[PDB]
Amino acid sequence: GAQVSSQKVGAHENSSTINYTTINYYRDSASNAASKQDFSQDPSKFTEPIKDVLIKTAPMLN
C-alpha cells in the first residue's frame, strides 16, 4: 500500500527524479499528514466577475 511521489528538488547536491515514500498507518483520513500536492486556479471569479467577458486590448466601456 505505499504511495511514491516526486520531490521538486531545489539545491541539488554536487552528486533523474528524486522520490519520497509515504504509507498511511491509520484508518481515519483525518489522521493523515498533509499531501502538499495542491492545485492552483485562475483568479477570474474575483478579478473579473463581470457578465460580459473582457478583452484587455479593447475599450472596457463600449
Binding site: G1, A2, Q3, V4, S5, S6, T21
Partner: peptide
C-alpha cells in the same frame, strides 16, 4: 503492491 504517482 505500492502505487507510485
Amino acid at each position: 503492491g505500492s502505487s507510485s504517482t
